[PDB]
Every structure is written in structure tokens, then in C-alpha cells.
């Protein structure tokens, strides 16, 4: 405690590097807020030979929690197989967007085995797009209204071949008896956005 | 899976004629939607995609519109090389799917 | 400058494997922005969907295949593939490899022949 600002992936000392991973992630302790992107990435749990990376811990992702905000974009382009949603960001609250993926997007979550997001903390994206895709078990999604958190003249989401809406319903995959019709990240109370 | 209805099934125009092609889904798939031409002995070739917008190249005769469950593929004036097969295409949830094409045939 | 190419065996007997290499020239397999693909259609009849590889190692197969499906790649020639196993007459299709790219247009955009 308290504030602390680090930079993000692709700026000052990690200018050069692709993905958060073993090496840096010890860096990342007690950061509040990010300036800059945060890149989550394949070669991070493989590691890599030509840079001298080790492969990374899974359970090191946690000392992301204390992350509230991210001046640039979150890519998150693998996550480990049996985690069921992002609990390393449950305590972000806003993506600003002052820099984007592939000049677009602000959030984006690619092919994971998620079953839920789980950014319980989500209040504001303030510029940028957002994508989540292929994402083959994943529910909830459609639930919230992503123009609430929206800043910006012509934010839209694009959620794409993930899970059908159907065969949720089916397994009682939906939000919680006393969630507000204003969704929710999860199955449980403490995932609703409102009460 | 969702499923993707085209009807009719086949066309039978003349040149310079007004084409109306529809594509209805199941269950919604917002603007999550494609269309493709085919060509015996070829792979099909995106027109539309969004719903919606024209890619790159496609002439301005091509055009589409609709949203959630129903859709349609208006080409306002044929040109001889525009008889050919079109299908409509979902990619708004797993697993992706297609439409069972309507045919665009030479009126004799 | 993007390009595909299927190929393997014209010829498979009932009961046993299906097997087919698509080759990509004009930028590395591994990627981010793409998801690998494969799509059928049986003489006469319409498109079906079969699944896609991404550079991740995760994967996402039609149910209607009775989990017969798998596909892998192969960076040390730019090259992904199709397994399919226990095949009938139900399986005879001309066979099509594509490509989508994620954060573009965000359908199938390149096919093979």
C-alpha cells in the first residue's frame, strides 16, 4: 500500500519483451496500476530458449490482483486449462484504452478454457473495442450490458463462436436467482453487477 | 447447433433483373453473419460479412442487410457472370454453421 | 501472397483413417490473428463445418463428428492437418482448408483449392 505505478509490456524496460512471463513477473509485485499493455501469451507457460525464459508458474498470475487499472489494452491469449475464469483480474476496474490491439481493441479474450470471465470489478472501458472469441465453454457473456461501461463514441463488442446461449440455459448455467437484469460475470451472488 | 434456412431454393432470373435472396436462423446470431458465392469446381468467395458490410473488391451491386433471424442478399442487377450458388453463414456461437445455398439459374 | 493447399490421399477404405495435410506460404502458422480450419462438401450437397487449430494448442470440433475429429501443426514445415477416423460413405466430400482471420473481417477470408 498504496499507489504504485509500473509500466506494461512493450514500453521502458519491457520495451523488447512479448508476453508477461517468468523472468518479469516478480516485477509486477504490488503494482496498483498499469502504464501501459498487458500481453498474456503461449510462449509465457511454454517458455522460450532464444531469450533464456523459463516456462511460468500458473499460480504467480495471483500477483496481478492487486492491479486496478491498465492504461492500454489486456490480450489474453492463453491461461491455464483448469482455471475456470480470470481470477488474477477480479479487482480491475478500468481498461482506459489510450492504446490499442491491432489499433482496435481494448479488451480481448482468445480460444481459453474458461467457463466464466470473472471481472467482478469491471466498471469502465473508457476507449476501444472488445472481443471475445472461440472461446468454446464459456457462458455469461451475453448477460451484461457492455454499453454501460463504454466512454466512448462507438465502442462495440464482438462476441463470437463461444458457447450457445441453448445449451447454458439447459445446464442451469445462467445468473443467479437474485442478480438484476443487469447480468453477471458468474453463477454466484458476489458475481451479479447489481442487487 | 443453429440452423440456417434459404428459401427459395432456386432462382430463375435474366440478366439485368433484380435479385432478393433470404436466410433465416434458428435461434439469433445479432450481425454475426456471411455470405459466399460458389462456382463449379471452386471454393466459395466472401461477399458480405457483419450483415452488412462489403469486403474488398466486391462490386457495389452486392449488398445485404438484417439483423438477429432474418436476413437477405440483394443484388440489384445481374451480370452474366453472377449465376452461381450463394450460402449464408453463422459464426455468432459454436459450432459454426451453414445454409443450404439458393441457386441463381439462367431464365430461358 | 497468402496461400493454401490440401493434400493427401484421393482414396480411404470404410473403418479406417482420413488423412490430409494443408501447406500455407506468405506469413508463419504461428500466430495470434488466425484460426487454422477445415470445412466439407459432399458432391451435390451443401458446406459443413469440421473445426480449427489455434497456435495456443487449443482446438474446437463439430459434435456432429462423434469425436472422430483431431487436427495438429507442424511449424517445421507451416503446415496444419486433419485426422479423421472410422470413415463410411457418409465421409466421401471434396475437402477444403481456410483461414480466419480474428481481428479482421473476422470469417473464413483465404480457402484452398
Known amino acids: 500500500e498504496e499507489k504504485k505505478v509500473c509500466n506494461g509490456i512493450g514500453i521502458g524496460e519491457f520495451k523488447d519483451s512479448l508476453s508477461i512471463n517468468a523472468t518479469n513477473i516478480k516485477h509486477f509485485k504490488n503494482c496498483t496500476s498499469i502504464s501501459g499493455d498487458l500481453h498474456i501469451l503461449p510462449v509465457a507457460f511454454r517458455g522460450d530458449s532464444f531469450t533464456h525464459t523459463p516456462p511460468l508458474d500458473p499460480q504467480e498470475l495471483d500477483i496481478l490482483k492487486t492491479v486496478k487499472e491498465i492504461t492500454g489494452f489486456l490480450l489474453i491469449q492463453a491461461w491455464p486449462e483448469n482455471r475456470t475464469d480470470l481470477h488474477a483480474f477480479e479487482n480491475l476496474e478500468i481498461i482506459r484504452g489510450r492504446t490499442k490491439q491491432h489499433g482496435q481493441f481494448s479488451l480481448a479474450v482468445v480460444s481459453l478454457n474458461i467457463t466464466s470471465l470473472g471481472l467482478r470489478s469491471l466498471k469502465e472501458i473508457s476507449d476501444g473495442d472488445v472481443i471475445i472469441s472461440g472461446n468454446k465453454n464459456l457462458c455469461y457473456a451475453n448477460t451484461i450490458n457492455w454499453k454501460k461501461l463504454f466512454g466512448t463514441s462507438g465502442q462495440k463488442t464482438k462476441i463470437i463462436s463461444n458457447r450457445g446461449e441453448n445449451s447454458c440455459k439447459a445446464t442451469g448455467q445462467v445468473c443467479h436467482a437474485l442478480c438484476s437484469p443487469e447480468g453477471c460475470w458468474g453463477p454466484e451472488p458476489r458475481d451479479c453487477v447489481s442487487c | 447447433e443453429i440452423v440456417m434456412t434459404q428459401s427459395p431454393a432456386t432462382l430463375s432470373l435474366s440478366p439485368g433483373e433484380r435479385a432478393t435472396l433470404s436466410c433465416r436462423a434458428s435461434?439469433?446470431?445479432?450481425?454475426?453473419l456471411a455470405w459466399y458465392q460458389q462456382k463449379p469446381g471452386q471454393a466459395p468467395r466472401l461477399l458480405i460479412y457483419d450483415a452488412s458490410n462489403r469486403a474488398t473488391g466486391i462490386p457495389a451491386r452486392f449488398s445485404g442487410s438484417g439483423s438477429g433471424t432474418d436476413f437477405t442478399l440483394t443484388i440489384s442487377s445481374l451480370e452474366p457472370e453472377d449465376f452461381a450458388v450463394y450460402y449464408c453463414?453463422?459464426?455468432?456461437?459454436?459450432?459454426?454453421?451453414f445454409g443450404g445455398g439458393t441457386k441463381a439459374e439462367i431464365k430461358r | 501472397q497468402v496461400q493454401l493447399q490440401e493434400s493427401g490421399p484421393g482414396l480411404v477404405k470404410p473403418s479406417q483413417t482420413l488423412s490430409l495435410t494443408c501447406t500455407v506460404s506468405?506469413?508463419?502458422?504461428?500466430?495470434?490473428?488466425?484460426?487454422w480450419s477445415w470445412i466439407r462438401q459432399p458432391p451435390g450437397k451443401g458446406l459443413e463445418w469440421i473445426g480449427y487449430?489455434?497456435?495456443?494448442?487449443?482446438?474446437?470440433?463439430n459434435p456432429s463428428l462423434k469425436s472422430r475429429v483431431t487436427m495438429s501443426v507442424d511449424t517445421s514445415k507451416n503446415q496444419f492437418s486433419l485426422k479423421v477416423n472410422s470413415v463410411t460413405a457418409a465421409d466421401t466430400a471434396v475437402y477444403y482448408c481456410?483461414?480466419?482471420?480474428?481481428f479482421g473481417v473476422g470469417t473464413f477470408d483465404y480457402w484452398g483449392q
Open positions: 481456410a483461414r480466419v482471420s480474428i
Open positions: 506468405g506469413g508463419s502458422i504461428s500466430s495470434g490473428d488466425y484460426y
Open positions: 453463414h453463422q459464426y455468432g456461437s459454436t459450432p459454426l454453421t
Open positions: 435461434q439469433s446470431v445479432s450481425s454475426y
Open positions: 487449430i489455434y497456435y495456443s494448442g487449443s482446438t474446437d470440433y
